[PDB]
Each structure stands twice: as structure tokens, then as C-alpha cells.
């Protein structure tokens, strides 16, 4: 499907550290190379090295392998959003439930949206996941610490983006419409969703949902979606052919002072004229969700598997 800016990394030693880069286009480049997932693993699970060797982000595994949104290199996964500061992919704890369905065996990182957040599981050096996903057993094949991208599993068809916040009263309204669309559901990922006399054990649950920036997600059955292209600065990346992403200084200058190269859309809305070149990130645009008579621009929208208990009467 191809990357946004940067072709897949070819790392040299597992012990090289990863710099913090201030520039937007540089961060996008780290994301194309799964530098951010590598960093997550080093921070949380005693991992040494990198994931994404050669293939980069375009070669990661998705659990519904039929995945629409990865066909667009520019739509952001939860890990992608975490590197840009829009949300935190937390380390899993014992109460977080691994969903059945994915092929966990041999994965070194996986991540799923939960009802109230985003949760990830990583493996230490020389290890990879058992088939239940519950433990990391030894795996001599991962001993180099420079692992291919199919060891990274992203659960769900998910798109994340900058949101326009909504007041708390609007959230409580959306929460009410969700409760009436799913009367049969008691808990989702351990969070009370409806009041129930008696409940079944937790079951796999595929559902459409949106993150609108409050205490938990809004799950949805009947809803409409629409894409608007807005040509703001985050929709463009800046590079210099044969050298990778431009620096932070060069990028701000290209996007303020209209004095760099560009494609049609970047010149049309920003102005142009050795120098850097900026062009359009490949995506349908920003997603807007219509639910319960409202329109909302969520932080994340997607379809994805969670755990839920159903009512037994």
C-alpha cells in the first residue's frame, strides 16, 4: 500500500537509541518505520531493538485482515496517534481482557481499543506470544532484535484524528442513545454499560464506536459517516527528495512563508514558487459521524472487537 514519506527501515544494531524529533514530518517518518512501536516496547516490556525491519508500518498485521483504513497510508492508528500526543496506548494489566479471534502466536506487539481507552501488550528480548496471547515464551528467531513488521498486530479497523471537543451534556446525550440501541449489554471491557439483574460471562463483541474525548466510547449501530477534506497544515508533509523529511525549521517556513515547492493542493492553499517540497497526505479526509441527530468530529472512529457481558433474564 506504500508509506507516507519514508520507506522501511534497515536497522544495524538493536542497541542504537531513538531520538526525539520535534518536526511533524519527522514524526510521520518515525511512524512509517514503526519507530514508535519499537519505542513503546523498549519503554514497557524490557525489549531491545526494533520492529518493522524492512517492511515498515504498511506491513503490519491486522486482526480482521480485511481492513479498509490501512489501504490509506495517511489514516492514523492508535499507536500512530500516541506518537503524536493525541492519546496514550497504556500497558495492559491483568484485568484487561485479551479478545479471542486474532492469531497471537509469535506476535511481539499487539494493541486493541477498549471501551475506555487503548491497551497494548509487548514482549521482552528473545520472546514472543503464546497462542492464547497471555504470555511471552522463548523464540530463538527473535534474538537479533531487528524483527519484521508482521510481528506487530493492530486489532480493529480504526482511524484517529484531531477532534473538536463536545460539552459533557452532549456526551451524556450520546451515551443515552447508545444504551437504548444496545439494551441487551451489561458490561463492556469490565465497565458498567447498562444495569442488569443477571449477566452472562464475557463474550467477544464486534461493534462500531467513536471516541469523543470523555470517560468512555460511544458505541453505535445505526449511524452515518462522512469525510471532509480540510487542507490544514497537518494534512501536508514536507520532504527533500533523496534526503527524507525536512527539519522542523524548514517545515514551519514552508508552511507559513509560502516559499517552497509543492503539489497542486499545497500550492493552491499555501503558496509556492534546493527548497523543500510539501504534498498531500493520502487519506479520505477527516471523519465526521452522524448519530442521534448530531454531527460530531471524533478523536477516533472504528469497528473493532471488545468484550461484553449480555443480560440473562
Amino acid at each position, epitope marked *: 500500500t506504500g508509506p507516507i514519506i519514508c520507506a522501511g527501515p534497515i536497522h544495524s544494531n538493536k542497541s542504537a537509541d531513538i531520538p526525539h524529533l520535534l518536526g511533524y514530518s519527522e514524526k510521520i517518518c518515525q511512524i512509517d518505520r514503526l519507530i514508535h512501536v519499537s519505542s513503546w516496547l523498549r519503554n514497557h516490556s524490557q525489549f531491545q531493538g526494533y520492529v518493522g525491519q524492512r517492511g515498515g508500518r504498511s506491513q503490519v498485521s491486522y486482526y480482521p485482515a480485511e481492513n479498509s483504513y490501512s489501504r490509506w497510508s495517511g489514516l492514523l492508528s492508535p499507536c500512530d496517534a500516541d506518537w503524536l500526543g493525541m492519546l496514550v496506548v497504556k500497558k495492559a494489566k491483568g484485568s484487561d481482557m485479551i479478545v479471542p479471534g486474532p492469531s497471537y502466536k509469535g506476535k511481539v506487539f499487539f494493541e486493541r481499543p477498549t471501551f475506555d481507552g487503548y491497551v497494548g501488550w509487548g514482549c521482552g528480548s528473545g520472546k514472543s506470544r503464546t497462542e492464547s496471547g*497471555e504470555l511471552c*515464551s522463548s523464540d530463538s528467531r527473535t534474538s537479533s532484535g531487528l524483527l519484521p513488521s508482521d510481528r506487530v498486530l493492530w486489532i480493529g479497523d480504526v482511524a484517529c484524528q484531531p477532534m473538536t471537543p463536545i460539552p459533557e451534556e452532549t456526551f451524556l446525550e450520546l451515551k443515552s442513545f447508545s444504551q437504548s440501541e444496545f439494551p441487551d449489554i451489561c458490561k463492556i471491557d469490565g465497565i458498567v454499560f447498562n444495569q442488569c439483574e443477571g449477566e452472562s460471562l464475557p463474550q467477544p463483541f464486534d461493534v462500531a464506536w467513536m471516541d469523543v474525548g470523555h470517560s468512555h466510547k460511544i458505541i453505535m449501530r445505526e449511524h452515518k459517516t462522512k469525510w471532509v477534506q480540510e487542507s490544514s497544515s497537518k494534512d501536508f508533509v514536507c520532504y527533500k527528495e533523496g534526503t527524507g523529511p525536512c527539519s522542523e525549521s524548514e517545515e514551519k517556513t514552508c508552511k507559513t512563508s509560502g516559499s517552497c515547492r509543492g503539489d497542486m493542493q499545497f500550492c493552491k492553499v499555501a503558496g509556492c514558487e534546493a527548497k523543500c517540497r510539501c504534498s498531500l497526505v493520502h487519506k479520505p479526509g477527516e471523519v465526521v459521524v452522524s448519530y442521534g441527530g448530531m454531527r460530531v468530529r471524533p478523536k477516533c472512529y472504528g469497528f473493532s472487537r471488545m468484550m461484553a457481558t449480555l443480560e440473562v433474564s
Partner: antibody
Amino acid sequence: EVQLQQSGPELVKPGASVKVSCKASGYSFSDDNMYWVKQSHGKSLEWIGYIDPDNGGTSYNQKFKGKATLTVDKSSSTAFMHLNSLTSEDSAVYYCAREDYYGSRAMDYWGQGTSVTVSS
Amino acid sequence: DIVLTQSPASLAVSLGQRATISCKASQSVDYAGDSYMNWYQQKPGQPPKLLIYAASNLESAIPARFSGSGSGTDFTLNIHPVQEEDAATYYCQQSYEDPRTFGGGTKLEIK
């Protein structure tokens, strides 16, 4: 590297209390539960309790509920164990250990141990 | 609580020979394809050191003379070829449920 560092040996009088510390470094403190284990001299290892440093939630061995109290300080990466109403039956080496729930579900890093002698 | 019974309580093995230690649980510690059983080595004055987690996984930097096997309730720690540094007390420990429990331990002496 993960490392856990316990406070030094302790001499305390019967009926008194004692507080032991365990300082974690080399990883993000609130990611993993911290366990506490008792080992009387020559005897076997016994579980006392654990604490989730992210939110303070605790679980105790029934044998030590009311005897031991577990706390942490997030800002300084330290876990604490308070022992009260000391008798001679509380003299032992006490360990802290980090559990890697989704890696090995084992206690893969331990502190060096804190010797506690209860006598007058 | 899940009670763990180690045997023998004490065992003597000649250098270069094989040591075989047993642990029996009073209930299964298996769940969805893994066995939640760990083995620790403890020398006098030091903390336990993790050798084997989940029945058969060697912790990093543990020599391949150590191996573990078993499933459900019956587990084995093998040391072959036994060496001088292997003199210690070996503990099993189940991680299936709260409360964690430990076996009584097996002291390995060298002949």
C-alpha cells in the same frame, strides 16, 4: 536493567511496628504489581500480598490481613510494607519482587531481602 | 488455595549426573495452552532467582542444563549435567490464581 533495592536490617521490640521500603528503578514503576514475600530462617517462602502501584489496589494473603499493610510512593518509585504488633513469629527475611503479568507471570526481579529481628 | 508438594525434600547427585525434582499441584494450573508454574533457585543469603517460567520457558541467561516439563498438576525440573554452582534449594510456585503459593523446596547437594 530492572533493579529493586530494599532498606537495611531492622531490630524491633515485641508489640512495636516496623516499616520496610523497596526502591524500583530501570522500568516504569506503575506498570507492574509489586509482591511481598516472607521467608523464616531455613523455612519456605510465603506470600504476604501485592500492590498495584498505579492505583493503590491491594490483595493480601489471608494469613497476613491486618498484620501487613502495603503502600507505594509513585513520585519516588518506592514500595512500602508496614508490619504491626510484632511477635517473635515475625522475625524473617522479607522480599519485594516485581511480577511481569503478561510476560512470564513470574517474579523475575527481587530485592536483596530485609532481615527483621523481633526481640527485646 | 492450591497446595504444591515438592519431592524429594532433599537430594544428592554426583557431578555430571542428572537431577530430577518433582512438583505436584492439588489442582490444575493450566489455562488456554500454558501451564502457570514457575521454578526458582535460591542460594543461602540471596533472593530466589527465576529459572523457568510457565513450566518450560528458560529465563534469559539461564544455562541450557536447566529444563522443565509437565502440564496440569505434575511438573519436573531437570538439571543435566549437574555442576558445582547448582547446589541450592529449588522452589516451584504457581501463578494460576490469587493467592500465589510455593512448594516446600528441594535442597540439592553435590556428591
